[PDB]
């Protein structure tokens, strides 16, 4: 329908993560795998991607990817420290990796501390061929020039993605938020390059149909892909499953 067609798209777009040990990833992998289509991957801490590459590919879906976090879910300003941790989720065999922006330190005044975080961590990604997130963690941001301003160093330190969320704070994605961090890629005409991902708290299929509308609207229908779109999130799957008539 119009909110079936929205829900299968954004099970696709799901990195779903759990809602954490061997046998509660192992059951993630395979609730990855639904009635409808796999979601684009899973979301898990960086040393379970062993473990979780081998369920998916003995259950016959090794194309859902494995995405996890560094500087998580604190977001402190040690560079050396995100850096170390990112090179330990690629060395896992991490094919994303979402790293938190050092957003109390802007908060604080310091643009250039997220600058060359997100810098360092997106050169050594990019030398391993896998893809960097950049949380900004809206819910605590607040302020729209703050939440705009985040936006806009993490894609000048050359983020892939941008994210409104951990989902370890009260506050995560909203409507306003992520379109917020949508016209920022527009008006820094970084549509090609750069994906958005709401993250923390989607729960329902009305939700993620509201924030896939917003990119439709913005970018055009065709934009949002598993490169430039998901949806971080763990019981949405259920809601997006039941609007689909499973469960």
């Known amino acids: 329908t119009d909110l079936k067609a929205s829900s299968l798209r954004a099970l696709k777009l799901m990195h779903l993560a759990t809602a954490d040990t061997d046998e509660k990833v192992i059951a993630l992998c395979h609730q990855a795998k639904t009635p409808v289509g796999t979601t684009d991957a899973i979301f898990i801490y960086p040393r379970f991607i062993p473990i979780a590459r081998k369920t998916l590919k003995e259950q016959g879906t090794p194309e859902i990817r494995i995405w996890t976090s560094t500087n998580f879910p604190h977001g402190n300003d040690d560079i050396d420290i995100a850096l170390a941790e990112t090179r330990a989720a690629i060395a896992y065999g991490a094919d994303g990796v979402a790293v938190v922006f050092p957003y109390r330190a802007l908060m604080a005044g310091n643009e250039q501390v997220g600058f060359d975080l997100v810098k360092a961590c997106k050169e050594a990604c990019a030398a391993a061929n896998v893809l960097l997130s950049v949380i900004i963690e809206t819910g605590e941001l607040k302020d729209e020039a703050l939440i705009r301003k985040a936006s806009e160093i993490s894609i000048k330190a050359g983020a892939d993605h941008i994210v409104t969320s951990t989902g370890k704070v009260a506050v995560g994605a ?67 499953l039941k609007a689909l008539g499973h469960g």
């Open 174 to 240: 909203t409507p306003e938020s992520a379109r917020i961090m949508m016209e920022v890629i527009r008006d820094m005409g970084v549509e090609k390059t750069v994906g958005f991902i709401p993250a923390g708290g989607v729960r329902t299929a009305e939700e993620a149909q509201k924030y896939l509308a917003i990119a439709d609207e913005l970018f055009g229908a065709d934009w949002a892909d598993a490169r430039h779109y998901a949806f971080g999130a763990s019981s949405l799957l259920a809601s997006l």
